[PDB]
Design a protein around this nucleic acid. Sequence first.
DNA 1: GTCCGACTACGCATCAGC
Length: 635
Amino acid sequence: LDPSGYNPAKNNYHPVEDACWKPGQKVPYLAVARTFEKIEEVSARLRMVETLSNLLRSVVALSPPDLLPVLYLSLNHLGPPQQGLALGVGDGVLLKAVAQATGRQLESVRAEAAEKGDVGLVAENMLPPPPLTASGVFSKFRDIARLTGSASTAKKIDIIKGLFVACRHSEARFIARSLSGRLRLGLAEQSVLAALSQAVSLTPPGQEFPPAMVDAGKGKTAEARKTWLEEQGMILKQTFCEVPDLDRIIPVLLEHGLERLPEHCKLSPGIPLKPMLAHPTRGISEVLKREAAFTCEYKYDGQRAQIHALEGGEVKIFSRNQADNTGKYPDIISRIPKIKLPSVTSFILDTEAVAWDREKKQIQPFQVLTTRKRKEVDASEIQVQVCLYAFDLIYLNGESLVREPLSRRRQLLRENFVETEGEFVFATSLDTKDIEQIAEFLEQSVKDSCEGLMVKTLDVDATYEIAKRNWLKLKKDYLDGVGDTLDLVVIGAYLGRGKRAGRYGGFLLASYDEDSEELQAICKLGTGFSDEELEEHHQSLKALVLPSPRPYVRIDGAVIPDHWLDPSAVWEVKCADLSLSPIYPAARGLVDSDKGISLRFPRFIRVREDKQPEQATTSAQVACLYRKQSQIQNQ
DNA sequence: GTCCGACTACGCATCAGC
């Protein structure tokens, strides 16, 4: 009756009686908002899943059509990933609507949200319009994302204001958080899926209301109930891993149930699937710890792109995040038949796209790959060539290869696909087991301009069932002593948002150009320190805050830190590679005439108390490390 | 170990302001 006191975390929660809306009527957003409250209140994931499951049970019982917008609102998504909807709502756009919402000056509201690290609390602080609807709020979110062209921003601000005026109680918090891409419930895809699997198992969909089954975990023992829901979750997890498309799963789920879901949502070309992720290992001996026979291929520094081929001849290319990248590769849709044999009529390969120079015939760094255009590229104006390095086969002429080992998948992969020096090659896989030649193959990969070594089993736990587990990642910056260690000067600091609200979330580091007797910014640092170390910083680091920057510091086109600090702290910082920065001035001119050097994948290691600012890593050295890189020393 | 959310550089794509 009154969604203002809605409680989805109640003991012995009844889907119908404990709800806050009438069946067949739309789901109110306050019901969704009060649950997010009960989810951010706790920290146990099994508690958040049960609380969100209570929403979905009430939703599947009272308003089945509203199930999809509730899920997307929970995931903070707008639809399937291959659709490509993006809010296009900047931060400043949101606080512009926030100031337009209440009435504070944009200079005042912009300061509050920065010091708080969250706009939801800032926005929450006329006649009442009708209460907000969950599916209608999701519609306004989609309406915002589709707004494009000139003057589209001011039209987005109107829609956001139209929601913030209709917000009741805590609704203003989660509309603002969702629009900025920071719901921060502690609950995401894995827990949303577990909560949706739970709901359709306790409250089966498609029941004549009032539903004859509101709690199907009634006559079950708690032991056999946990395995019941765990077996139900696994059926949903794997189906979603083959078809990560809630616009396809929910209609089939809502009508045929969870048990019959895999019989209709099958992995087929044209629909992207979740790719197999890797896992970072410590050292070479850390790999020999599971020790089963495995293979070892290079880890190529490019972009993950899986290539689908429908039976009808159409070819599509999706990215690691299911985003449609077919318009990005006209040079691939053309060279499609150059890799397949006559017997190939349908396929899906897990490849990595790396930039390839035609003249030198060598692999280019990652920066060259990300310089290609997107949207709708014409194959005539393609100035950055790309070469596929296939390392898995998922589909082959109507058949799905999910339940097959890497040893067999690699069989048909090499059997039904022809090489092409410069356009199509297989990831160089050296099958072995001895740790002597294994570490040798790893340090070789760098000479062939690669990140490191891929390690995946061949038979034992070697399927492509991403839901069950299984791959090992091994490059150079992981082993202690093999990474480029820089002793850098902390010159800037940035106020943190969310988890790091209050203290600093980032820091601006600098090398010491001994030639100009000045500090040069090189990169930012926001990972690699413990929460006690962050509290160890920020506090001891606050006694050195200064209003104006020192004259001997130089940041060029880097973000102005929220706090300038007296250069004194010297930090040990590990990094993967070194990058040619179009933003940072460190060693500007020492390699490229205009661009400096930045750190790729930097991270904090430890503070150097014995080291002084003058006794830190110089920009002069920094240039030699960029020249000593094998990806750079191959031109 | 899982899951989540802090955070990194780089570069295309886009739009308010001019």
